[PDB]
Amino acid sequence: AVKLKTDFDNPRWIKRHKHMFDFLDINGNGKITLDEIVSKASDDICAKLEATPEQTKRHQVCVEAFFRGCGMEYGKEIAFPQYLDGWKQLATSELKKWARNEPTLIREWGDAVFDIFDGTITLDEWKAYGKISGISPSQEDCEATFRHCDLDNSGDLDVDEMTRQHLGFWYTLDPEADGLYGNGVP
Ligand SMILES: O=C1N2C=C(c3ccc(O)cc3)N=C(Cc3ccccc3)C2=N[C@@]1(Cc1ccc(O)cc1)OO
Structure with missing residues (x-):
């Protein structure tokens, strides 16, 4: 039962996103652009994953939409407070879409990522994504991810499940989502 109540002033949610912000801020100058995010998605991740140009393009479209959702744009340097707003x-927006059974941007992003690893992904594939995207380079943390989630019979991770977990993790600070990335993301 996905938590739909938001908790935007909870220091743990704020911290989760500051962590991710600093993670995206290679430079460390306190500012990020859509250009850097998309380059990470397309030049870094998709290339290393050896996705087809079609998969690469659709993934890029999903990433663009997702981060434009938080006010990011090409050529626009954004600092943390604006980022958080x-x-x-x-x-x-995403929770409203989810409630109405309209596809979320996080779901569609998920569909792109899973399509690259193709309707599930394995623990090894997730460790690969973890090290390549850099969100979860500790394989133990990825194993903690697979222990956290409800896997299928094959021991693999479903995109429905990962979407629910991600809703809980990024949007609502759902207690049921805590530890989704092990100790990799607070
Ligand atoms: O969810 C994910 N992410 C969330 C954030 C992120 C960034 C900033 C925040 O403030 C909060 C979250 N950053 C990255 C990594 C990344 C960032 C940018 C471009 C490419 C990849 C990321 N990768 C995902 C991709 C994904 C999506 C759906 C799935 O079902 C499976 C995998 O996997 O967990």
Whole structure:
């Protein structure tokens, strides 16, 4: 039962997103652009995963939409506070879509990522994504991810499940989502 109540002033949610912000801020100058996010998605991740140009393009479209949801844009340098406001807007919109059974941006992003590893992904594939995207380079943390989630009979992870977990993790600080990335993301 996905938590749909938001908790935007909870220091743990804020911290989760500051962590991710700093993670995206290679430079460390306190500012990120859509250009850097998309380059990470397309030049870094998709290339290393050896996705087809079609998969690469659709993944890029999903990433563009997702981060535009939080106010990001090409050539626009964004600092953390504005970024976080943008995330409040994104979360709100996404939860409204989810409630109405309209596809979320996080779901569609998920569909692209899973399609690259193709309707499930394995623990090894997730460790691969973890190290390549850099969100979860500790294989133990990825194993903690697979222990956290409800896997299928094959021991693999479903996109429905990962979407529910991600809704809980990024949008609502759902207690049921805590530890989704092990100790990799607070
Ligand atoms: O959810 C994910 N992410 C969330 C954030 C992120 C970034 C900033 C925040 O403030 C909060 C979250 N950053 C990255 C990594 C990434 C960032 C940018 C471009 C490419 C990849 C990321 N990768 C995902 C992709 C994914 C999506 C749906 C799935 O079902 C499975 C995998 O997997 O967990």
